[PDB]
Amino acid sequence: SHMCDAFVGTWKLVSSENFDDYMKEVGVGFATRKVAGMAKPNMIISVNGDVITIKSESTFKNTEISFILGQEFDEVTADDRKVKSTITLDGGVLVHVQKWDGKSTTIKRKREDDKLVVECVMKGVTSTRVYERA
Ligand SMILES: COc1cccc2onc(N)c12
Ligand SMILES: NC(=O)c1ccccc1
């Protein structure tokens, strides 16, 4: 077993709050905000050795990242930013920091009851996205 065990599986989006405002703060343009905001992604998390893979699949886009904790990687986000990302585990929370163009945003993923709660923060704006097992 490893502690990241509790994240592994297939998850479906069940609620979202403030995501349009988060996207505005990140710099996402109108059309992508509307279509991305409509999406109901599944999140598929797996682990093989030290490598964690997170896939996010929707009618809008299918994305995939694989990474080792603490080891930076380059990521093309669903909104087409080219970012430098680092993901760590802090007290049981996956903490994903994206850097680009002198800006930064942080996405936290945590298990709470039977949910996987995703908190996205850009400056003072937070969006909370709740997933449940598929
Ligand atoms: C991280 O992936 C997403 C985050 C937010 C909305 C999304 O729509 N399609 C996606 N793959 C997606
Ligand atoms: N999984 C999500 O819904 C998500 C939203 C925004 C940024 C990263 C992930």
Report how far apart, in Å, the C-alpha atoms of 20 and of each of 17, 31, 97 are.
8, 11, 19
CA–CA gap between residue 66 and residue 86 (Å, rounded): 11
Method: X-ray
CA of 118 to the centre of ligand 2 (A): 7
Domain boundaries of the chain, sorted by first residue: 9-131
CA–CA gap between residue 97 and residue 101 (Å, rounded): 14
Residue nearest to atom 3 of ligand 2 (CA): 129
Resolution of this structure in Å: 1.0
Closest CA to 117 of 3, 15, 1, 38: 15
Are 76 and 82 in contact by the 8 Å Cβ rule? The answer is: yes
Q: Is 133 annotated as a binding residue?
A: no
φ/ψ bin of 79: left (φ > 0), alpha (ψ from -120 to 50), beta (otherwise): alpha
The domain 9-131 having CATH identifier 2.40.128.20: the answer here is yes
Give the number of the atom of ligand 2 that is nearest the alpha carbon of residue 16: 3
SS3 state of residue 7: helix
